Amino acid sequence: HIESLDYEINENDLFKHDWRSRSKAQVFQYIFLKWTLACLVGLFTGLIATLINLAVENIAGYKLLAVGYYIAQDRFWTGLMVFTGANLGLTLVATVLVVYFAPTAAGPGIPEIKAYLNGIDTPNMFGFTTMMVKIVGSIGAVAAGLDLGKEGPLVHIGSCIASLLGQGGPDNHRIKWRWLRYFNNDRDRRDLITCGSASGVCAAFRSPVGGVLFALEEVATWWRSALLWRTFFSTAVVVVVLRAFIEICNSGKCGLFGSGGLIMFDVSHVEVRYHAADIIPVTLIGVFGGILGSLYNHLLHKVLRLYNLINQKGKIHKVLLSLGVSLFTSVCLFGLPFLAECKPCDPSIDEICPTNGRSGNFKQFNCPNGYYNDLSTLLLTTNDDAVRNIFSSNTPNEFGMVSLWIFFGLYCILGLITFGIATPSGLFLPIILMGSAYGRMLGTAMGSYTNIDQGLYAVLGAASLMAGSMRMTVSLCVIFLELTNNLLLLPITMFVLLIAKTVGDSFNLSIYEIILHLKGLPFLEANPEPWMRNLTVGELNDAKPPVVTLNGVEKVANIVDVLRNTTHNAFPVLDTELHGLILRAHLVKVLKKRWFLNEKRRTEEWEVREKFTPVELAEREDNFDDVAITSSEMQLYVDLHPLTNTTPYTVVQSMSVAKALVLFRSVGLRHLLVVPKSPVIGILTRQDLRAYNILQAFPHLD
Amino acid sequence: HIESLDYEINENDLFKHDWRSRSKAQVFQYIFLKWTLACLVGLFTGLIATLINLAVENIAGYKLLAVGYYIAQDRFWTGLMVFTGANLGLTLVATVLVVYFAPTAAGPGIPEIKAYLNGIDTPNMFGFTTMMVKIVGSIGAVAAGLDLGKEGPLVHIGSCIASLLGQGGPDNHRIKWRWLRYFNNDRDRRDLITCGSASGVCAAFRSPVGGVLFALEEVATWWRSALLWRTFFSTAVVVVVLRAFIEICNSGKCGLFGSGGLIMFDVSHVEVRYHAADIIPVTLIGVFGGILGSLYNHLLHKVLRLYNLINQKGKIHKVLLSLGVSLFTSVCLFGLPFLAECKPCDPSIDEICPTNGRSGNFKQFNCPNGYYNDLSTLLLTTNDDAVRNIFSSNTPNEFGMVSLWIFFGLYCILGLITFGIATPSGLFLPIILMGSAYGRMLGTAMGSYTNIDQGLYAVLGAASLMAGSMRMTVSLCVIFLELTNNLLLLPITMFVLLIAKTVGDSFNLSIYEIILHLKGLPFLEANPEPWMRNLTVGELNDAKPPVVTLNGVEKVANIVDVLRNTTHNAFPVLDTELHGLILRAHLVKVLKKRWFLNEKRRTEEWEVREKFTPVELAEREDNFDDVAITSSEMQLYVDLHPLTNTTPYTVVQSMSVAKALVLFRSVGLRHLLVVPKSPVIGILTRQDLRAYNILQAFPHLD
Ligand SMILES: Nc1ncnc2c1ncn2[C@@H]1O[C@H](COP(=O)(O)OP(=O)(O)OP(=O)(O)O)[C@@H](O)[C@H]1O
Numbered sequence A, B: 001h002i003e004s005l006d007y008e009i010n011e012n013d014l015f016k017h018d019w020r021s022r023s024k025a026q027v028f029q030y031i032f033l034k035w036t037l038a039c040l041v042g043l044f045t046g047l048i049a050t051l052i053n054l055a056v057e058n059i060a061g062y063k064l065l066a067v068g069y070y071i072a073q074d075r076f077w078t079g080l081m082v083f084t085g086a087n088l089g090l091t092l093v094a095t096v097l098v099v100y101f102a103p104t105a106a107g108p109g110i111p112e113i114k115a116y117l118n119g120i121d122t123p124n125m126f127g128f129t130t131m132m133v134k135i136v137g138s139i140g141a142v143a144a145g146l147d148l149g150k151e152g153p154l155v156h157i158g159s160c161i162a163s164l165l166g167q168g169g170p171d172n173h174r175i176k177w178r179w180l181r182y183f184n185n186d187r188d189r190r191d192l193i194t195c196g197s198a199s200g201v202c203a204a205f206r207s208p209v210g211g212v213l214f215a216l217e218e219v220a221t222w223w224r225s226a227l228l229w230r231t232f233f234s235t236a237v238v239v240v241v242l243r244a245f246i247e248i249c250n251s252g253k254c255g256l257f258g259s260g261g262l263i264m265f266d267v268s269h270v271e272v273r274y275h276a277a278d279i280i281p282v283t284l285i286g287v288f289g290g291i292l293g294s295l296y297n298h299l300l301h302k303v304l305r306l307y308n309l310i311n312q313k314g315k316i317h318k319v320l321l322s323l324g325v326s327l328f329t330s331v332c333l334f335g336l337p338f339l340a341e342c343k344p345c346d347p348s349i350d351e352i353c354p355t356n357g358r359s360g361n362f363k364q365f366n367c368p369n370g371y372y373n374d375l376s377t378l379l380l381t382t383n384d385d386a387v388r389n390i391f392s393s394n395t396p397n398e399f400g401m402v403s404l405w406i407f408f409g410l411y412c413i414l415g416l417i418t419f420g421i422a423t424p425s426g427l428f429l430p431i432i433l434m435g436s437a438y439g440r441m442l443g444t445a446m447g448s449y450t451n452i453d454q455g456l457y458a459v460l461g462a463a464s465l466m467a468g469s470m471r472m473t474v475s476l477c478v479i480f481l482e483l484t485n486n487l488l489l490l491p492i493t494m495f496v497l498l499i500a501k502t503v504g505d506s507f508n509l510s511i512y513e514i515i516l517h518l519k520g521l522p523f524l525e526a527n528p529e530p531w532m533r534n535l536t537v538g539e540l541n542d543a544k545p546p547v548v549t550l551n552g553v554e555k556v557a558n559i560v561d562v563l564r565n566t567t568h569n570a571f572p573v574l575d576t577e578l579h580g581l582i583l584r585a586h587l588v589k590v591l592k593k594r595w596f597l598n599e600k601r602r603t604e605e606w607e608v609r610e611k612f613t614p615v616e617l618a619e620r621e622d623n624f625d626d627v628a629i630t631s632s633e634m635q636l637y638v639d640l641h642p643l644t645n646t647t648p649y650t651v652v653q654s655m656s657v658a659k660a661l662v663l664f665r666s667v668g669l670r671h672l673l674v675v676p677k678s679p680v681i682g683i684l685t686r687q688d689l690r691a692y693n694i695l696q697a698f699p700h701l702d
């Protein structure tokens, strides 16, 4: 059972949850520190992605320089040992750091950021040790040549940066600044994780509006306009710190990092003129992007089920699974470009075709001079440099269809098997490389029957597999605009994203919906099901246990009955008069404070502010299993009146489940009371309004 | 009193408001027709903006060719008569069509699209005659050289296209297609007006994600993900139809239209490298954009107040106000470039400086050959061509500071006076030209102390005045990206948009908030005020008249008492048992159907489907003042049970006004019932939850 998050506002001024109801210094202190924390989320995600890209380009660049040194001496067996050994060693570093120190840093974190911004309290997700294992595990596993990026891990790294900046450092290492007392809300934490995840998609692609639109469209359930401006400011500070550190280390000051433009996979030197002959391969790239994105979603759901059978078997088995996946990745990225025959160097293409090194197009791996290997252009590089080889402006029929089919089938296989291993893996770059493969294949199959470039058909195929897997339209359009710098490919990119989202929704759910189902996270979707308009929430509460209520002045003994014997996290406060909803955290707080009255007396509001500060009520640093309540003190009384949420959101008994789900998910509820049309008769949570748990208790509905 | 819109769903299956609760053909008929209508909104807004841009570039281009023909013969007095006469004639065409035929086509329509998508039933806004007067009035007033664009009018024109496509043509000219019966909802109309307004911002700037983000950020209050995809599809079909009609008429096939690129004001051939010396003029352009945008918002509020004093005085006075504004515009766009001395032609600048014609940079208006007039480059062109003269890549110190100050002070004066006249005017292009003026002035004032181009400082100044007036961040960033094609100016554009929104919010509201206040439209803002957490909705209902309720089986005489003597649009249905909320429209419908029972009988559900189709309940084609109810029939009975919204949204009496405003504006309510903690005690509408009407009844709150 994962608990939800409390984003509702107790409108008593003992709690001071509304930030505008504070002092005029403290409104200014909140406004200054939330824009400072948006600037610091931008500065720290930009600096960490600078250090991640510097370490990945230096380690994988010097590995491929050593591998190409043994390749250029025609020693192809000991260049396989250097490639397989450095990739096994970097995956061994990333996997002993994940499975022995921070196992929630495995995967991208985006299905549990989208769980957390929907209001599910996902444990161990945003920590310091989770952040540092994800930093050096992306530094290990992207430089180990694997089919993953540092793109999705940066979304988890930026939201981990945001939670440590908001709470003030690591847990039991926090500074006790009094100005960080206003970000102890769950609804101010949700703003921070939204700005940090948007800064992570901006640090992924050098994409500052597509980070804002990935948060809006995917991960954030609730959106204000006052968040979008700080989310905007966080992504602006990221891409400024990123492109300033591509402006520095331009003259080779930082090793092999920075030899490259400000714009990642910049294709912008081509004309995009729309013709009526290219309607048919553009919708074919959309239809095959939705079909292969649905097939990738179904086969990754099956692969992550069989990898969850390995992930429960032990912690040495996750090491051996990912080292076997990394051994398979390095053997098939080294040995498979021997199957491609060397194409000769085309004089119609502008730039230099006899090219050896660590990066660049037209690799010269097992060929004579004046020839190039078109498979080792893509397999024996980094995964980001292989995108720009497929994405190349004005290289017509560079890759053959056999080498494109080998690179497609390999990155289908490595797209399935490298996602579910226990490194910080991701889904932006493998789905980009699979879509690049079939998009360049459909561009090469129309040999001089089209006027769109084959490297532009690659961008259309990559955006179609990203729409066919993730079912997104607006966020990946600004992501592929801020990657590829083509403003005229943008409406054709819009058409292939919409065709692949609609062909993809015919078969599967989204790929973030699939891992949210597979991790068991209780996600609450937007539109209710049409059979929830026929079920009532009075009928939903008769299929439930009765309401564990409290009084206004309870005894201590009944409060420890509802705290020992129940697992519920809010309780209605009664007495013939519903007062509201007290929380479990405030019940453990009044047991730990020992604010115990000898008579049934409603206290005044000077007796509560002497016992409870607004920083005392917001702290969740209480456990129930330390309080030794003496049995003389169990016949004393606690006034539960001033700690009650005296205005909770209610529904009537005659309210339907579809309208109650709409109020539960629009205003951000954790507990919705049910009153009659006994002043309370029911209480609805997220578990009662998810459609799967309704269809357990009511199988006769659709 | 402007009524709100009914976007709530009656979950009885007599009404069939949920589209998924229909037949399997009709779910497919709704899905096919909503994507057909999104394609048709895209096709018709792209074709109408093609015809608007074709007519504006041919009429104003041949006017400026005739004016430059009299200028090149050194006949400067009869070129003033051709300029003033054609601008007075085109403004006379636009003003007799606005003030005598469709006076809601005056202005941009964006403060009453944002009213309509907030759920205020703005009358006479989306019609056919309003659309056609706005088409030929933008064709008149942009070709009359005025300080307005066809940018904001296209937002009203695309939403007018959307409402006529959704309802099936003009009012009392609609086709009676049975497949258009599902778009008779107000919540399906709201989806249409959102797709049409997004298609209008896309037809404004050739900007297909910035249209989607202008709807999200500004005009649409409620946002689903299932709308964003059809809104995405509508803007994709617009910019495809727009750029296909720039691909055709490229060889002069359509007159003077199409001589120009696919990208409007394309500046993309410059490097944007960030330096630490240019931190200070970039934040100076942001601070002056917020300060002059606040000063423009305050002075346009005063000018529109004094123009509302002219707009009530008659219909010939609005003609004479706009003809005097157009006479002042043409005299000061012709005569003021004689005050600028001719700068000589710089050989450091690449392209051709002795340039005469109708368009282009470096105009040669009153000069000798080898010289150019830098004021007639901006004043004696079209308003869009004068943007690209300021926005010019690599023209260093082209405009002098005196000519830039004359163009700034003129477009400040003409930005105030040409907005409130009764042509279809707008605010995107005058605020762009004012911000271009001071942005190029701050670029020229740092003479070789900066490395950002002076035409790029223009884009920063234009985005700062657009943020200083409209208080937007994300939508104008994609609008200026899809205009200027500079992906590296984009984070500097983000910084000047955020600095000018935050300096601008220190003084004023937004410029759409100001005309929403000035037109008296009851807009409902997102966050409640902090004094609404201390007021209760039980206390708000004791400062109100008591509840005009109904019974379940009322008499006819009590139904005509609540329909004659009240103006309320929903009534609670009682009897010791609250059933729900029947609407006023269903009460007039059961009086017009004459479903009158002789006894107090609750009917069965076969008696209602014989009397009421689901297309009969959705039609609002009923007036109350035609029904002649006989006094024998007033002692009969109507079963108001099957027409009731039996699950309305309720609050308790102890609920605060701040949480009730949050539920009113999140789920899209028109009537929120108040139950006790008499099963109803109150009913809240939009008027009760606006903060201004609370502060009338409760002045002691903050
Ligand atoms: N005070 C309460 N009294 C009785 N039932 C409750 C109470 N609170 C929650 N429930 C019900 O008990 C079931 C278990 O919910 P749970 O114990 O998880 O509540 P919770 O932990 O407060 O909610 P969440 O886990 O969503 O934060 C739910 O179906 C819910 O409706």
Ligand SMILES: Nc1ncnc2c1ncn2[C@@H]1O[C@H](COP(=O)(O)OP(=O)(O)OP(=O)(O)O)[C@@H](O)[C@H]1O
Pocket: B001, B002, B003, B004, B005, B544, B545, B546, B547, B548, B549, B567, B568, B569, B570, B571, B572, B670, B671, B683, B684, B685, B686, B687, B688
């Ligand atoms: N059935 C009703 N009985 C009593 N008062 C009502 C009823 N409906 C609305 N009111 C109240 O009367 C006042 C005037 O509202 P109005 O007459 O405009 O209702 P309405 O027209 O149904 O709502 P709207 O105009 O927002 O659609 C409001 O303050 C509202 O709270």
Ligand SMILES: [Mg+2]
Pocket: A001, A003, A567, A568, A569
């Ligand atoms: Mg629980």
Ligand SMILES: [Mg+2]
Pocket: B001, B003, B567, B568, B569
């Ligand atoms: Mg009314």
